[PDB]
Amino acid sequence: EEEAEMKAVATSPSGRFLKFDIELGRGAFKTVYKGLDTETWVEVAWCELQDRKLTKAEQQRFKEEAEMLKGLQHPNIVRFYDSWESILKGKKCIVLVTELMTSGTLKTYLKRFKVMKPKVLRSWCRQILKGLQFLHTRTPPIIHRDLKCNNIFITGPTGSVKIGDLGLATLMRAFMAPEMYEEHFDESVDVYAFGMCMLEMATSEYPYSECQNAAQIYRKVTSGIKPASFNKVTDPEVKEIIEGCIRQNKSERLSIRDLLNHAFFAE
């Protein structure tokens, strides 16, 4: 495609991708930079993360994750290209390289468009569900463990959506027995997440806004009191789905296929 100079500041160990000193955004211990895939000439995302004092066992796990993730290709999963261990500044960093998303998250979308029309929520939600089923039906099944409106990215205002922030779950993680530090998850935790997401999209309100501190929310949730937002849901068919998803007893919650086999989500 035409011609190009490099004038890049760093490159992937594979030599495939180049980093520019053009910072795109600055989150937690993350900093995203603009970059290029020499192979496709397509603009890409160079995520400088930080040191999460990665034990080591987990390092292996991350690598094993990376492989899978790189292999993944779906119309609704922000493609993962590559990752590696680097010493930027003075601290042991992990760098990730992914499909660059340019049109902001649902959240940014919500902050801008203020409210969301039925058609949108219907389509974009379906799109998310599709993505999830894809991840869950991977072999072995991959659990997001962290779906939120701000890591659901949109292709265009008029476009489609895709699930992002792919590995960050593992990456960003008295005396008691080790098995006490064990976090046990399953697919259904993603359904729970999804419902919460749908609700926020539907009400343009963050669930449990009412709450004032962390410990307060704990009570409400563990006691299965729904967020004040829930009541503010207008369409009763939506309300159905939201409820079914956020059911406190995990074994009573809906499944992905069930949501997709729902009427609202029928084509």
Place this chain on the structure above:
Amino acid sequence: EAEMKAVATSPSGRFLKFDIELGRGAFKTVYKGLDTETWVEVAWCELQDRKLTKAEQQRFKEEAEMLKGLQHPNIVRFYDSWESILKGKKCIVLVTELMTSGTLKTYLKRFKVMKPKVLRSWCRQILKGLQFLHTRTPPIIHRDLKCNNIFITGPTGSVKIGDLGLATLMRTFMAPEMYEEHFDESVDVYAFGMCMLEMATSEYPYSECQNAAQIYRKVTSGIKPASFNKVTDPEVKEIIEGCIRQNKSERLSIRDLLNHAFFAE
């Protein structure tokens, strides 16, 4: 000689609170009391509010009913409990057998080193206690075994596991299942190993690690404390290892430990 200079009474009337403080912990305070039935003195633990839900209150109530029932030598007796407002805040009151002769922690502090004959006898006893709790029905898991909650009758006496209810009472947007705590018997087998190790080396395990996190890495990575290596008796050393195996299914069971030679006669 059956006086009633008190400040408070149990709902049942059985127990009376004296206005004399025996200790002041985190969000708790212990005062002296009286089982007017047996006429024996007792500990009256005014706790504090633990931002409790309510479902858990029910659970705790059920737990506590189980507790009132228990009788074993190597367990502090538990008498009564109920909800109360002191000052402006909801508190939970606990009544238990009064232990005045301190803990393993206060014992190591005073005597500096533990004699191996003692260790053999007392550790034997802690195992006996845990076996009793684990064979309750439902099984009772401590979750929070430590040396400053293993009490002794006296320097020439024996051991009783305490801080019984505090596992549940003190604890130890995301789906509720994420708040669930996943413990089993081994969690206590693990915590016992730490108890035994402290006793063997008169050092608090992982005394080394200044940062709390430094400990996380080691534990999660499967690294035994510095003090582990300082265990001079090989038979003791093996037991501690078998207890603090990071793989939960690899750790010994209570039965295993009791069946072992070290713990015998």
